[PDB]
């Protein structure tokens, strides 16, 4: 049998890179 | 004055609260993925091995 | 062999579930 | 008066600070569990390919 | 005095942001590290099932 | 054949312990 997780890696690394919005300006 | 300086501090709480939620919720779907993902693989390995 | 990872499994939905517990209420 | 929105803007911080590190701790247990799974997933796979 | 008083809820505010973007940071990276680590599983124990 | 996530694990680990120093000191 395969296995299909490529939804939740794409998410994951999607989240991980999104973060970046979630941060908060010093300036 | 001092009513501007302190809406200012309250501006930046409301700024931190909102981005933290932001980030929470972003990080409680990166943990269901990482569930789901987890359980996929722990089911197809141990039917490989059956 | 089998894996036995169900203990986390059910700790990671846990934690995605009860992080609800930790958010700001801007109320 | 500028005593009481000081205090109020205080006890905000307060509870910033109390949700955030009760969030760290929940994510640094989780951390823990997704490596332990990760960890006996590589166990497991390695061991049936050998 | 009460400028003392803005200070100090300002520098706790800046501390808040540095700790919850220093803390994003490492949970960035933690998440790089989940879904590369699932990514080979999911490759390895597809290609033992072929 | 077989797999090597270890850096991987290793970094979990490493984040899950230094997270420590990322909390706010309520004193």
Redesign the interface.
Same mark, same amino acid.
């Given at each position: 049998s395969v296995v299909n997780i490529q939804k939740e890696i794409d998410r994951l690394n999607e989240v991980a890179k999104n973060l970046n919005e979630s941060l908060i300006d010093l300036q | 004055g001092?009513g501007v +300086?302190?809406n200012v501090?309250?501006e930046?709480?409301?700024?931190?609260?909102?981005?933290?939620?932001?980030?929470?919720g972003?990080?409680?779907?990166?943990?269901?993925? +990482?569930?789901?993902?987890?359980?996929?693989?722990?089911?197809?390995?141990?039917?490989?091995?059956?």
């Open positions: - | 001092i +300086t302190q501090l309250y930046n709480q409301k700024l931190i609260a909102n981005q933290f939620n932001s980030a929470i972003k990080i409680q779907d990166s943990l269901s993925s +990482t569930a789901s993902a987890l359980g996929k693989l722990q089911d197809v390995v141990n039917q490989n091995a059956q």
